[PDB]
Amino acid sequence: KWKLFKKIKFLHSAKKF
């Protein structure tokens, strides 16, 4: 039906330096 992994992917780009 969906995937909560699409929420952890944006968290990976939030670590931008």
Strand, coil or helix: 3: coil
Greatest Cα pair distance in the chain: 34
Token reading at 2: 């969906």
Looking at the chain, the residues that come just before a C–N gap of over 2.5 A are: none
Q: Which residue has the tokens 């670590």?
A: 15
- Cα 5-12-2 angle, rounded to 5 deg: 15
Q: What is the total residue count of the chain?
A: 17
- Buried b / exposed e over 1-17, threshold 16 CB at 10 Å, is eeeeeeeeeeeeeeeee
Strand, coil or helix: 17: coil
